Structures are given as structure tokens and as C-alpha cells.
Design a protein around this ligand. Sequence first.
Ligand SMILES: Cc1ccc(NC(=O)CCc2cccc(NC3=CC(=O)N([C@H]4CCC(=O)NC4=O)C3=O)c2)cc1Cl
Ligand SMILES: [Zn+2]
Ligand SMILES: [Zn+2]
Ligand SMILES: [Zn+2]
Ligand SMILES: [Zn+2]
Lengths: 821, 396, 82
Amino acid sequence: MSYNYVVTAQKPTAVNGCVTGHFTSAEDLNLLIAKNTRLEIYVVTAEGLRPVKEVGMYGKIAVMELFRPKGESKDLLFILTAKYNACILEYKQSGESIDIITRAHGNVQDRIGRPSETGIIGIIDPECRMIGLRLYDGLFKVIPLDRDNKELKAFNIRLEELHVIDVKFLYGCQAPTICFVYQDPQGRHVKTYEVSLREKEFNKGPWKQENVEAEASMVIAVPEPFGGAIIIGQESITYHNGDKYLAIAPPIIKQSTIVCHNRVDPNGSRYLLGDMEGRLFMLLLEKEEQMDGTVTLKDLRVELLGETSIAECLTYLDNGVVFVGSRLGDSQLVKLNVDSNEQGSYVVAMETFTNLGPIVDMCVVDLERQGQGQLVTCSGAFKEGSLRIIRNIRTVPLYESPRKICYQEVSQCFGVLSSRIEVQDTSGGTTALRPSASTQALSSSVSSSKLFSSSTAPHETSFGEEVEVHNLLIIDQHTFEVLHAHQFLQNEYALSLVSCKLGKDPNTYFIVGTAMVYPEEAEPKQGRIVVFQYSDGKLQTVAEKEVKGAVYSMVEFNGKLLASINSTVRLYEWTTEKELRTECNHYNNIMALYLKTKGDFILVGDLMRSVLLLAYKPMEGNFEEIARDFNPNWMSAVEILDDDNFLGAENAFNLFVCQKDSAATTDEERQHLQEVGLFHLGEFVNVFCHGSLVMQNLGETSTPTQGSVLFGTVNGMIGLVTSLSESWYNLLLDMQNRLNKVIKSVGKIEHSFWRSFHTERKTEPATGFIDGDLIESFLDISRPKMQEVVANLQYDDGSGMKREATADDLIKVVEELTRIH
Amino acid sequence: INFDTSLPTSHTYLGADMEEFHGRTLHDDDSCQVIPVLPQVMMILIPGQTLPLQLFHPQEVSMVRNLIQKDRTFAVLAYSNVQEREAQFGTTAEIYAYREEQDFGIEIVKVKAIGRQRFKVLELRTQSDGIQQAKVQILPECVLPSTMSAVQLESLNKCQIFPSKPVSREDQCSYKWWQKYQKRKFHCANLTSWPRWLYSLYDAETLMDRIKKQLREWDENLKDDSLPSNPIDFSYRVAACLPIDDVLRIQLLKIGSAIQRLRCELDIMNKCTSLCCKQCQETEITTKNEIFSLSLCGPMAAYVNPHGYVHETLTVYKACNLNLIGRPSTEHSWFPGYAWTVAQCKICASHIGWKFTATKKDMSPQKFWGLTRSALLPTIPDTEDEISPDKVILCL
Amino acid sequence: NGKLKCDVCGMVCIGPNVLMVHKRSHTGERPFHCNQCGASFTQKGNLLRHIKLHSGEKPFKCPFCSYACRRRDALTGHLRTH
Ligand SMILES: Cc1ccc(NC(=O)CCc2cccc(NC3=CC(=O)N([C@H]4CCC(=O)NC4=O)C3=O)c2)cc1Cl
Ligand SMILES: [Zn+2]
Ligand SMILES: [Zn+2]
Ligand SMILES: [Zn+2]
Ligand SMILES: [Zn+2]
């Protein structure tokens, strides 16, 4: 038995969707934003954005599109989830009560069917004839938009083109027509089909197969005035319409791939394009009246507007205001000006919505209060990379990618691993793209070692190729200025980082694990463990130990250094000569990627969820394997809850908990960790960390929860996991089952189905976990429904009774729960 | 290098053309089945591997008739202890060819089957007839999505597809294209807490091409056609022709993920460089540098002798510490055009295999060695520097 | 149960047809063949020794302590130590 509780401390901040329309009322303009499981609804005003409504769904929002059927006042919202929950929602408001009622819903998953390589693709007919879904290769699912179709009954159509890249619904066609780019052994081609709902099949398209460029990746349907479609690849942008086929290869777009678009003018005269590196261009379609009124396309033009955040999605609001939704960095509201500025940019930032972005590492530090903790995270990537100090948000921009972070109280500063991309120069060296933290440092230094300077492989890098330089930044804990930046060797990749005191030495060092990464060398055969000391504003190399592999992880192990070099878990001692001395080795069947420790227990793991539990035998002086559990599945992070329980995150955004059976009968069962917890979290965990963001409370007053483990995810969501008792767990489980009956789910998605452990192979129900969000939602509902929940419910307020539970006893319990984060 | 790699797979030594079937039988995953086992079969069958058999015993002939009339599937037990007939896993075999002949007044049956599904043995139950059944649980093939499939950004989904393969030996052997492949496929590695080269070690296609680079060292047939593209089929086809002992093969059969199977096969191909005598454990017979493919299946394939014994023969160029017994003969030669001579270990006299010598001067190779897998033992090479003996433990 | 036994090589067969057909593989020089590898021998005892070398394969075993030696004279020298 597990008994665990998980709650959201910070909602997902990364924006993955954004669409404009008339969702609330046909008059005012609305902007809908999709942050994974959250949906935000704003009204577009002349000043900025007016928050109207925020809702949460029981599923990851994959598709989100607005559409107004024939004979409807305002627009409806179609949403598909990762678990293939489709639904049509409508905005309804009565006086001052806002509710997103579910007009239709249903699951559109197909038992058997290979998911496509380009992921789920959802489109809707311009005249709302149907909803076309591309979920599995070789099949095209169709949901007919009829007033009778309430369950969303859909049918598949045989698709001869297996490898479909992008697909859209065309404008101005007699019958609903789809246009899509696909790839076969002869290259990529754009093709059209006519979807017949009567025949329930495909028919010849207006203009069938046409050859496109090799990297053709994006398809855009042009509205009625123009018609046809626009195919965007890596080097060229083409427009196709029946007989005419115009193409331009502007050099201004060659340096990066365009990955997102959005329509400016409703007639299709202008479009916004965003590339991977944040660049924002304007694609213009010139008109040609042709006198009688046929309006044909004359020419195509691309004009670089400027630079924004790395845009996942774009949407033009109005009056030159553009919303940039970002996954790697903060979201933006930017203004487009006509005359540009002195630098030449036509874009001007307006608002910066904080996005914790991909939290790759984090730590908890007391800092100021000397009582409650604060959370420092490495967020963002590339020029969006930064540090975030969350209090119970302070941003420190780095303009390069942060990887690992650790705090050193002795020196009152943090040590952070980071990497910056540079490009091979004609002279032979490398040149930076932009001034980042590693370059704009007060003190600087480079690793001048002799281990690999003489032991190096012969090779050369061509001009233009990108190479990342790794650095260790020493950053003040108060001002957060880059005090020092130490650059590592060429072709050296820094993986692990710790700050601790080793052996009798009273000094606190920064220990970094590295690995020599060469292109021709698949698995690393060289690496270093470098022990630095920061003092007097400078970082000096105290010790250097070479290793025959990659130092994936390191942990402080009872005054000794526990490192992982490929398959080996090694244990070093800090000699009086200030050098690392090998004391123990343990060779495993897996790659020691994840390394955690608790006292004398060591938890080892690899990328395929191969959990291993070892123990250091002090009297013998060697390692001993206690147990293991090998179930193939992609694992992202792991952590040790207590002496017997171990928490981890595996594929499909799932959390699991294994347990060590101690004092059993058979050695066989003793050496096996039983899977005692499964729970679909919906987030991709990248780092677990013991700690809490609330006041630890001096006077111990019987805490209901034991333990505290925060975790950071890719969508910026921060979560907290804790342990419960069997009584509390059973009570909260019954209470969840009771809440599900009275609570109203957006899209009418079953909570049981949402939180159930799910992978493409097996999908089991959730166990050993308490959804803290569902439990804490009890305080935000009406009192009659609270009474419904506690109806015929027995509660224990302390030893005796065992009495009829009131809504307010449970309110007290839930308010106590809400004080853990 | 002009034999004809299509000759060994035909098993022309078995006689006239056999009656062939086109139907296929597959049981549901995790389902329970009761399948008959052939008494004298001692091989460890791998899915996709061809198994030829000559049955003389009346019990075996009757059982094979009954099978030909039913689903044509029998169970090949992977024996951990062959003496006491212990088995925890196994593979199903589907008869796809048979010939029922009454020769010189005795009735015999020749069969060509192929491995289908792995299974866990739940019960071994020998009827009063002397023929036994197996209560069995079909083991499912674990197919995992791309390690990047979860973290891949929606904007970058359209960019994951690559524009065809170079399939030019020099262009693909040049690591520039693989630098490009790693940069493109594992870009979203920046979102996670690990780099790209890590995920490359768990990538089906990367591992499959690393294995292709080793298989080209054994055969000059291009991957364009001969090798499969599916990771399951590729992993099984590689496992079928790896000269390892029965315990390693059992451990490899226990793997359910194609990723782990490909990784273990790469690790075996890189570590075990020597092949010694299993009885000696120390007498070296050959090395992986001499392994070469004389058949389309690869360097190693199963063949049946005139008396029904099955030998997984591995074809190598050179071999040492072997004494030849008798004189060459072409009778029932598994390689038409070559004559075989019994080969024993110089130390222990274990039948290690045979020495095949061409019958025509124009044939190439003029001589090679066919070693039976049951008599070989994979071995790591003693380090050139004795002071450096790093651990070479089995890795997967 | 195998009631038909060959006089020359002593193999057990099920029916008289099997034995009759088996008896023609003998007709010739070195008639004793091994089914495992095909080694021919001029006498039955040599073939039995060979087929024994196929199994446990222990060459010259000691009857008093169970230690095996590579050569006959080595085994004699060892036997003189008990
Ligand atoms: C039912 C029945 C069937 C056959 C016979 N009698 C014969 O077959 C002739 C005498 C004889 C005796 C023993 C063995 C053999 N055969 C061999 C053993 C062996 O391993 N190979 C390899 C050599 C390498 C290769 O490439 N192919 C091979 O088959 C043989 O040839 C022949 C008698 C009866 Cl009752
Ligand atoms: Zn030997
Ligand atoms: Zn005989
Ligand atoms: Zn023999
Ligand atoms: Zn003795």
C-alpha cells in the first residue's frame, strides 16, 4: 500500500494554444488561450486584455478551434484532448454566473490504429459541414456537424496517403475539400480530396497531386477572395490555386524554419509567420481585380517585422496588436508599427506574461526569511533561458540555456550550469550569437587541462555548424549578477553538479561531472569530475579526476562522493591531499542515469524505468544490491519518498510509486519492488526536490501529511507530493468518489478516466494517489452540494465518533490540507 | 564470394518440393493456450527463425499429422536444464511446409516451420501417450513510442519527418548525416534534463543502423532490401544469427521491448569478440572477425542432419585448434557444392563442427568452417594491457 | 519400449522396417557412424568411445577420486598417489 497525495502549487504557465473569435458574445472580440489543462478566455480591449473566465479541463488540450454553425448567435468552441476526448462547448452567462456548458462530447479513440508522426491534427470546415480529425496514419476521421449528432458519432475514411504532414480545409468550394501535404518515396506532394458525407468517402479533388519542395511543412487555407492554399517549406513559399502555381524563395527565411502562422486580414491579404528562433515576418498577398471582379493573386512578399519570444503560436488581435504564445519563454503582447524604429524593428513589446517554461532543474533555498523556503528554478531555453525565484515572479534573464542549479550557503551564492550556442567561424574558431550570461560575466576563466588535450580524437568542424559551449556560472544570491563564469573544455558536456563538504575538509566545493562528447563517438568514453572552490570572487580548480565515461549524476553520500560513470556507480573519498580516491565500485545491468540517496540506500535508474535499489555496507566496504524492478517504459525523473517508497515519473505524463518489501519470506520476493502507485498527472516531470514553500511551523501540532516533495514540469507547472495515513487516504478516496458526482466537468470528461494510468499499450485505473486539486475544489462549491457530498458520511474528529459528518468539519479538514502549499 | 546465398535457405538437401501453406495463425496477447511440444526438439527458437525437422518416430509423425490438420502450431521449449526437461519460456512454431513420404517401407515426415510468438510456460503436462502438452501464456511485444514523442512541440511536429534516406554506403557511413539525424530528431531534448546523445542510445533507428554497420562487416548485401525496417522484425532477425550460448539466448528471448533487444544485441556484438570451445571454456576456436554470411539469413542458420538432429551452423573463414576426422564428403551437405569433414577440438575432441571444402576450383570461398552453436562459447578478449581489466559485464 | 536391437551398432529401433533400413548404412568400410557428427569408425568400440566423448566428454576419469586427466599415462601417475 502506498497512500499518497499530490496537489498543484503552480498551474501550467506554458501556452500551447491561442485562437481569436467571438466566443462570449457576437459583438466583442475574444482571445482564448490554452495552457495544457487550463483554458483562459479574455476580451480584446483597446488598452489590452480583459480577463473574463478561466476553466480547467480533465485532459491535455490538443486541439482548440472556434466555429459558428449555420443558425447560431455566437461561436462554439471545439476541443480535443490528448486522450481523444472531443467536445463542443458554448459560453453562457446569466447575470453574474459564468458557465461553460457542454453542448456535445464523446471519445473519438480507435482501438487499433498507429498514431501519426505529425501528431493529432484537427480542422473544421469553413462552412461548418464537419470536423476532420487526423489521429492515425492512413485514416481520416469525420464528425458530421448535425444538430442530431450529440455523442459526436464519427466515421473513418480510407486514406491511401499514409504519411500526411499537414492538412487544411479549403475555402470557397462547392463540397467540403481538404488539401494536404504528404510524402512518398518520390518526395513530398500536395493533394486535394472532396469529403462526401452521403457516400461517406473521398472524391477527386479540384486539383489533384502537385509536387512541392522537399521540406514542405505547412499548409494554409486562404479565404474566399483568393482561394487555394499556401504551402510553406524551408526555403520557399508557394501558392497553389487550380491552374495557377506561384512560388517565391526569399532569402530572408532561409536561416530558420517557419513553424507557426496566423491570419491578419480576414480576406487573406496578410499573414504572420514565426520561425524557431523568434523571428516574426509578414507575408503579403497582392491582389489583382482583373476588372470584372475575379480578384486573383498577383504576387507574394515576405517582410521581416522583427524578433519576439520563441513563438509556439501566433494570433493577431486588432489595431496592430499581436499575441505571441510561447513555450520556451514568456508570453508576449507586442505592437506592430508602420515606421519601425532606429534599429529597424517594426515590433515593440507591450506586455510580458510570466512563463516558468521548461523547468529543467530547481532547488529550495531560505534566502531572506530564514524560516520559510523559496523555489529557484532554471527555466526557458536559448535566449529565453532564465532563473525564476518563486515566493509564496522574480525573473533573472540569462539569454542562454540553464541546465542545473545548486545553492552554496557558505559563499551566499548559486552555482548554475548553462550552455550557449555559437557558430563555426571561417577563421576556425566559434562566434557567439548574442551577449549572454556566460559572456557578460565579471570574472572569467577557462579550463586549462591536460587530460584530453593530449588524448584527443582527430576531426574537424565545418563552417556554419552550431556548437554549444558549457559554463559554470557563480551568481549572487541577492543581486543575481553573474559573479563568475568558468568555461569548460572543448567538446566537454557538463551533466551533474553538486555543492557540499567532503570528508574532514571544512571547505565547501562546487563539484561538476562532465563527459567528452564527440560526433563520431556514440557512447562517451571520457569524462571528468572537477572540484572547484569559490573564494575572493574567483573560482579555482581544487581537484580534477578523469573517468572512462560520462558522469551522469552525483550525490553527497555520508561525507563521500557518489558518482555514476555509465554503467558504474562509483564511491570516492576526499583524501587529506585534496584529491578524489576511488573506494567502491558497483557495475550494473543498466545505465546509472538517475542517482538518489537516503542515508545508506542508493536508488539507481536508467531511461527505460529500470529501478534498482542498492545499499552501502559500511563494515564490508562495498555495495550490495537490495532489490530491483525492470518494466520497460520511458522514465523522466525519480526520487526517494521514504526508506521503503520510491516515486518516479514515466511515459505518458504518469507518476508511479514502487515499494521495498522488507522482512518477507522468500529472497525472490524480497528483491522485487512492487508497483504500489499509479496516477496520470498530465505533466512531464523533469526534477523532484524535497522541500516546502510554506512556513515549517516551529511548534509541532500533529501534522496530517508526512513528507514534502516538490516537482517541476515542462509546462512550468509545479506540484507537491506528500504521504498520508491509511485512514486519511481511505477517507479522501471516498470523498473523491463523492465529489465526482456533484462536480461538473468541462466537456463531461470522467475524472476516473482522466487520472487513470495511460500508455499506448495498457491503460489501468489510478491507485495510491489522491488528486489534491479535486479535494481542494470542495471549498469552492455551494453549500447544498457540500451537504450532498457529506450525505450519509461517517467522520472521525478524534478517537470517539465516528459521527455524522457535516460540510464544515470537512471544510476544516480541507483548509488544513490547503496549508501545505 | 560467388556461392549463392539463396541456396542454404532453400534446404534443398531435404529432397523434393514440399507442400506449402499460406494461412497464418496468431494467438491473442496475454491469452492462455495449450500447445503440443515435439519430444526430441532441443533448440531455442526465435520468432521469425526457420526450423527444419525430420521426424521418424511414429508418435512424432502422428502428432505432426494432427497439427497439419489443425492450426499447425507446436511449442518449442527453451530448456534451462535440458537433462531434466525444465523450461520457463519458449516460442511457438507454425509449420509452413511439409512432406509425408513412405520410403523403403518406413514412414517419415519432413517439416519446415517458423517461430511466431514468445510465451511463458505455465504447465508442462505429458499425456499417457508419451507426447506432452504445454499450458502457455503468450508474451506481448512491447512497442514504445519515440522517447521524444511526449515532449515534442506541436510546432516542430511537421519537422520530425526526414526527406528519405541516402542509402549510399559512403554517405551513410559518413557521420555527418548522423549528426544531422541526431540534431533533428532529438531537438526537444533541450526541454528535458538529458542531452541528445543520451536519447540516441535508446533510438530504434540509430541502434538498427549501428547493427547494420556490423552486419555489413559480415555480408555485402545492402540493407536496402534484405534487412527489415520494423524494429521488432529487425531485432529478431539479428538475434537469430548471433552465436551465443543457450543462457544468453534465453535472456535475450525474455526481452519484450525491441529497444532493449537491439541494445543487448549491439552490446553482445561489441563485447564478445572471441568464440571458444564450450567444453574447454578456454580453448579459442575463432573470432568475430572471421564471421561471414554464406546465407541470406546471415552467418548462422539452423539445419537438420539425416537423422533429425538440428545444428545451428555458423559459417566462418578461419578456425584454429581443430582436428579433422576422416575425409570430406558431399553426402547431405547443407551447402551444395562443398564437402564437409568432421571437426573436433584439438584439446577435448568436442565436435565443434565441420570444415567445408569446395568441390570445384572455380568456387569461392574455397574453404570455410561451419561451427555448431551448441559447442561454442562467446568470450571477451584478454586485454592488451594486463594492468587494465575493466569490468566487461553483460549490458543491456 | 524398443524391442529391435542392431547386432552391429546396437541401436534401438521401433519396427523391423527401421532396423532393416538401418542395416544398409553399415554395408561398407568403416560402417559405424555417429548420428551427431557423422564420424565413421572401423570398429563399434571406437564409435561408442566417440559418442561418449560427445556427452560428459571427461577423458580419463579416476575411479577412486573422480579427477579427470588429459592423457592415460597422466591418469596412471595420479592413480599411483592413492
Ligand atoms: C533414418 C536414417 C537416416 C539416415 C541413415 N543413414 C545415413 O544417412 C547414412 C549413414 C550416416 C550415419 C550417420 C550420420 C550420417 N549423416 C550425418 C551426420 C551429420 O551431422 N551430417 C552433417 C554433416 C555436415 C552437413 O553439412 N550436413 C550433415 O547432414 C551428416 O551428413 C550418415 C540411416 C537411417 Cl536408419
Ligand atoms: Zn575443447
Ligand atoms: Zn547398426
Ligand atoms: Zn559424433
Ligand atoms: Zn583416485
